[PDB]
Amino acid sequence: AMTSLEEITKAIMADSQNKVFTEKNIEPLFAAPKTARINIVGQAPGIKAQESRLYWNDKSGDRLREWMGVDYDTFYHSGYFAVIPMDFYYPGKGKSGDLPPRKGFAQKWHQPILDLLPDIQLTILIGNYAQKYYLHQKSSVKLTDTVAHYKKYLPDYFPLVHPSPRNQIWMSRHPWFEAQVVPDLKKIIQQIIQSS
């Protein structure tokens, strides 16, 4: 049934939810190498990732790799990273940036994909949509609170804020993120990459 990545991809494409995308030759975008040990869950691709078929290949991603303590080559080519965001399609242009990931999309497709990733040791939850879903939180739970007590969700999950330029002021107001949280992220990732 839903037991290979190709079968899952075909099912996503066939879902009437995605008919506009399928009729424009836009496939769902997700990175699920069977060797993956770390799953990064963010929001959704923008138009540029929709075209490149790569996540994080931008300044935001450069900052995230710096946080994680991995270089560009290791991130894209080690085979240890999965990227399975809350929507696999670009949701469209809103007033400030992209519109949000579509409600109900992860509920459909994430688990069958994760069932084909047996080596995942850590799932990194970037931003509100990813955290509220995987941590089963009401929308009124505060992002800053979740990240400040990140150890609550370990070993399975590590919540982060987005490595966006707009968050630079947030980081200045919360130096404990760069001082304590990010160093522990690096430590945990190194143990996982060196593991087995």
Helix (H, G, I), strand (E, B) or coil at 31: strand
183 preceded by a cis bond (ω within 30 of 0): no
Helix (H, G, I), strand (E, B) or coil at 120: coil
What is the domain extent for residue 162?
1-196
For the residues of 87-118, what is the DSSP string, one character each?
A: -SS---B-SSSBPPPPTTHHHHHHHHHHTT-T
Distance (Å, whole) CA 3 – CA 66:
35
Strand partners of residue 126: 160
Residue 34 belongs to a domain with what CATH number?
3.40.470.10
Closest by alpha carbon to 85, among 68, 101, 96, 70?
Answer: 101
Distance (Å, whole) CA 44 – CA 30:
10
CA 97-10-2 angle, 5° bins: 110
In the structure, how many helices (H) and strands (E) does the chain have? 11, 4
Distance (Å, whole) CA 114 – CA 117:
5
* Tokens linked to 39: 């799953």
Distance (Å, whole) CA 89 – CA 91:
6
- Resolution limit, Å: 1.7
**How many domains in the chain?**
1
Closest by alpha carbon to 54, among 67, 69, 70, 40?
Answer: 40
Closest by alpha carbon to 39, among 122, 110, 151?
Answer: 122
* Tokens linked to 107: 């509920």
Elucidation technique: X-ray
Q: Where do breaks (C to N over 2.5 Å) occur in the chain, by preceding residue number?
A: none
Closest by alpha carbon to 5, among 25, 30, 23, 35?
Answer: 30
Using left for φ > 0, alpha for ψ between -120 and 50, and beta otherwise, residue 79 falls in left
Helix (H, G, I), strand (E, B) or coil at 9: helix
